[PDB]
Symmetry: C2
Subunit: 369 residues, 2 copies
């Protein structure tokens, strides 16, 4: 008898939901679904994911991740994939713990360090404040790459306020030495013509990464931008469907692919996207926008994949922006030294969810009958 999945448990609040899997012999692993409306994701997982997993071989993640999107074929898109990513990440943890190895080792890497870029999420902050803040971060933690925001999120061509973009790009560049890589993200702001003009201005100021210039669901628009520019154009964080990834990569719509491990549905599906990209010659620089487990999943992936991109996205926002990210874990795995994060040799994900966070969570369980 191979180990079977006996119980699937969730521990949630509106923001974050952890997933705990237990086998019929008592071994466990912990994962997490995508943050945001996590309490709803939890319900989807019990209702639409768990019925297909209970009683199944616990080590056969490929079966589950392959079959459940077809069992629930009337539900294409985000919520199902978010729920599946919780089960997948918990199962990889379970395996790591069984084998006594970190997830990066199971998927072909080794523990060690990863270059991080400090990622700013605010469009609210003035250019001068953002330059100040990033400079202080560079001094304190040693970051040698940063990402800041331009345009307005799905802004249909409009900036956050008049002139913010023209100001911020050279203000940050001025504050930072040429040894510091600068990245920007437009959050689907521009049509292609405008996106190209903005991109030529980025190229005048030593910016090296241009993320989501156009509505992300319009591949042709993005492809027009990639083709017209020299700056690397990057995208993919909201793309949760493998057939969509195959199409984006066939079209070479971007220079760099940026799946989000939780939005895409877990490590297994992310590894398939990274391989598709590797076959086409494209680096994979995953999206990780907060300090829930999404960052640590990404750290393990970047230690492993042959076409890992240049750095880990590492959110530098504090408690005003992500108050729900504080005290998720017994010990933070996110200490940065000399601009680098570290994957340790601890088994599985190598973290423990805070008992203080768990006491107050909404718990739900599905058990194999």
């Amino acid at each position: 008898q191979s180990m079977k999945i006996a119980d699937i448990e969730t521990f949630a609040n509106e923001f974050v939901c952890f997933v705990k899997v237990t086998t019929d012999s008592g071994e466990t692993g912990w994962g997490q679904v995508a943050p945001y409306y996590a309490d709803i994701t939890a319900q989807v997982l019990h209702r639409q994911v768990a019925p297909y997993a209970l009683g199944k071989p616990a080590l056969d993640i490929d079966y589950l991740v392959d079959i459940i999107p077809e069992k629930e074929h009337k539900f294409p898109g985000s919520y199902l994939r978010r729920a599946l990513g919780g089960l997948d990440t918990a199962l990889w943890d379970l395996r790591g713990r069984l084998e006594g190895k970190p997830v990066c080792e199971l998927i072909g890497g080794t523990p060690g360090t990863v270059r991080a870029y400090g990622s700013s999420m605010k469009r609210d902050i003035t250019p001068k404040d953002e330059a100040a803040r990033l400079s202080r971060l560079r001094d304190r933690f040693g970051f040698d790459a940063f990402k800041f925001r331009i345009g307005a999120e799905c802004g249909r061509g409009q900036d956050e306020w008049p002139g913010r973009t023209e100001e911020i790009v050279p203000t940050i560049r001025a504050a930072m030495d040429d040894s510091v890589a600068l990245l920007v993200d437009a959050n689907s702001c521009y049509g292609p013509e405008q996106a190209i003009e903005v991109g030529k201005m980025l190229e005048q100021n030593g910016i090296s990464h241009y993320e989501e210039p156009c509505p992300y669901w319009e591949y042709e628009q993005t492809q027009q931008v990639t083709n017209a520019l020299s700056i690397d154009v990057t995208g993919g964080e909201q793309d949760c469907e493998l057939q969509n990834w195959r199409r984006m990569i066939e079209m070479k719509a971007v220079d760099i692919v940026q799946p989000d491990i939780c939005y895409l549905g877990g490590i297994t599906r992310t590894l398939r996207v990274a391989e598709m990209a590797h076959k086409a010659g494209l680096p994979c620089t995953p999206h990780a926008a907060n300090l829930s487990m999404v960052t640590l999943f990404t750290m393990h992936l970047l230690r492993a994949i042959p076409n890992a991109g240049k750095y880990l996205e590492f959110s530098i926002e504090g408690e005003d922006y992500y108050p729900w990210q504080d005290d998720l874990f017994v010990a933070s795995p996110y200490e940065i030294v000399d601009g680098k994060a570290t994957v340790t040799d601890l088994p599985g994900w190598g973290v423990e969810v805070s008992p203080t966070w768990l006491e107050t969570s909404a718990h739900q369980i599905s058990t194999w009958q």
Copy 2:
């Protein structure tokens, strides 16, 4: 007129939506069936905050902007919740103007030819032949759809030989004036799909629905290109950019959006219009007798490229126990094989108070 309150009334299968304006006018619609109590929570948390306080008559603004406000949730549930709001706002306008929804969208009250649509793979070919003959005798249907293959079957039939037998068995049981349609529900790869479709063509079948994984447009396109029988699809497609591509590709002969899975009337009319420009008929998917069949009836009374018939589920209580007693007066009477859109304002139905009383209710109110 502004949207003051958005209410849902749900169980696990069906959730109705009631919108009230700040001057007290109301309209009723429905989200897509299934996990409907999860869809209700999505509606309150991710749709209603963008609608409260907004002009009640401007449905275009809402259905256009909400998918962008919630761009982190591409896919089904957001769209299911949006269709609840859209259909209730169309009923509200219909009631305000004293007109059925079909008149608001350029059509007229009247009849629609229906096809009796079987959902079962369980049933033997002879039993399906018997049940359908009986339905033709009783109700006058002159078209039927039945199932072949297995749902998302990866090339396997429901049991060996079911498909080879059912196709000629139903064709032999039905007068030549009865049209026969099939649905493979994503069973086949293209090569197998072509071989099956060559058999359908030789056996008087005239409509071949979803031969391949719906998500693989190039596979379906290969089948459409190899066959003479009309290939059809679209019921799970809820993204307009995906519809654009499907149509531009001519991946199918006939598009079959589902008004509720796609996100309501305004969005389905955009799809229908994209199809009309590419010269494709639109024969929407409607698989149960919740309000989705009545929405489709009004759309087919109005759209210039309406396909041949309305999909009309012929399943009973054993398959859809949850659809009984939804409405005070059923809009679903069939005479001589046809459904009827009446001149009653809006959708022309009222949700049963007996169903409402046991529903789970939730409200979002403009502050």
